[PDB]
């Protein structure tokens, strides 16, 4: 079917540049206007502008003048978006889409989007802290254990429990920034009778820094 295929996610350094691609299949971009729209985390879509791949004419909205540069090539059916002098504020998902050149603005075809993450941080391995419950003698059923993964860059890190044997009952939260570095936590819930009689270890991996850390959760603090 008619499809717009965009390039994979990029993690880039502040001040640098990045060039995104959007390839059409099942149709030809020549008689369309190719538009790009940005979507920031927790924010609505904002139009960047369009290019007429037939003549090369482009139109940018004022906020992106000198920020974005669109190009196209009808023989390979590919449109490009160059983003220069990148900053934290450019972190967003970028979509290319298409609509008939004679059409006012309907967007019948959209690419899947490309996530661009801009940061001036260096790659940093995470610190993994065990989250064990205090010795509060109050008698209870199910027990919840966790691991705090903190201070790493870039995303992502993967976390499993007992090497994937403990899958049900685990919650691994989205990472959030704390002054340029990431942090997330993972919780696992098991029957009270099975812990600590049976070991519970969180396995954290951070491919960017070629690090793997296993933290066994033991009683106390």
């Amino acid at each position: 079917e008619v499809q717009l295929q965009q390039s994979g996610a990029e993690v880039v350094r502040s001040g640098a540049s990045v060039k995104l691609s959007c390839t059409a299949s099942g149709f030809n971009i020549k008689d369309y206007y190719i538009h790009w729209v940005k979507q920031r985390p927790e924010k609505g879509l904002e139009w960047i502008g369009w290019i007429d791949p037939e003549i090369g004419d482009t139109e940018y909205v004022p906020k992106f003048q000198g920020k974005a540069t669109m190009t196209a090539d009808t023989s390979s059916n590919t449109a490009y978006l160059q983003l220069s002098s990148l900053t934290s504020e450019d972190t967003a998902v970028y979509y290319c889409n298409a609509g008939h050149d004679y059409d006012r603005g309907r967007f019948p075809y959209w690419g899947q989007g490309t996530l661009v993450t801009v940061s001036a941080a260096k790659t940093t391995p995470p610190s993994v802290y065990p989250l064990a419950p205090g010795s509060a003698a109050q008698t209870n059923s199910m027990v919840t254990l966790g691991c705090l993964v903190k201070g790493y860059f870039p995303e992502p890190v993967t976390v499993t429990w007992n090497s994937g044997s403990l899958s049900s009952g685990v919650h691994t939260f989205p990472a959030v920034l704390q002054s340029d570095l990431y942090t997330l936590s993972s919780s696992v819930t098991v029957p009270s009778s099975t812990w600590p009689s049976e070991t519970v270890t969180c396995n954290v991996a951070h491919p960017a820094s070629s690090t793997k850390v296993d933290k066994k959760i033991v009683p106390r603090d």
């Binding site: 879509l45 979509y95 967007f107 990472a175």
Partner: protein
């Protein structure tokens, strides 16, 4: 720029329901409006255009109406595949603008969150930092409030909250709330408390620990 406002960020629905999503334009856009459907990490898709016309191939359960400044996307007999984000767009004039989106979610029985609080690990402490984490797992609906108290006093600064998307299997939500202080700030207090208020209880769920015991 014409502002397209979608007042509802989220809407709970059930398979079989008739659902309507609103979009308001700040200026008269005629019927020059389109609606798009989007699912996580996938291309948006054209559903409605010219305010009330169904795009080719879209099922007959989607309709749209409105003109001027008030528009509505209606799904009759909602289906599981319809759970997604929807957003309007005006193409009356430039620059083209979009609504911020409305996400259709699944309805289930209310469930009270399972709260757990954890002190800083001795290991993090040898590092000079102190994170106190609280998990609020498997609850429904998503509306929830977490409050921190240090020695019975509300702590506003230093807490970061993170939420998982509605579970694809059990339709619940989960959340983590973590208070990050320095070892010195943390060691100048005794009582730390994570309090969750949810419609599932009149008495908020309170979890805490005292540094001098643990």
């Amino acid at each position: 720029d014409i502002v397209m406002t979608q007042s509802q960020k989220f809407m709970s629905t059930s398979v079989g329901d008739r659902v309507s999503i609103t979009c308001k334009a700040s200026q008269n856009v005629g019927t020059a409006v389109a609606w798009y459907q989007q699912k996580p990490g996938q291309s948006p898709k054209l559903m409605i255009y010219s305010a009330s016309n169904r795009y080719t191939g879209v099922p007959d359960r989607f309709t749209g109406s409105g003109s001027g400044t008030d528009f509505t996307l209606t799904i009759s007999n909602m289906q599981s595949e319809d759970l997604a984000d929807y957003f309007c767009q005006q193409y009356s004039s430039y620059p083209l603008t979009f609504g911020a989106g409305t996400k259709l979610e699944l309805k289930r029985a209310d469930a009270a969150p399972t709260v757990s609080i954890f002190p800083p690990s001795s290991e993090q402490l040898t590092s000079g930092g102190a994170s106190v984490v609280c998990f609020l797992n498997n609850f429904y609906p998503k509306d929830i409030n977490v409050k921190w108290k240090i020695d019975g006093s509300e702590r506003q600064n230093g807490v970061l909250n993170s939420a998982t998307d509605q579970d694809s299997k059990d339709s619940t939500y989960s959340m983590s709330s973590t208070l990050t202080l320095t070892k010195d700030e943390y060691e100048r207090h005794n009582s730390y408390t994570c309090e969750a208020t949810h419609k599932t209880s009149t008495s908020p769920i309170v979890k805490s620990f005292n540094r001098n015991e643990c």
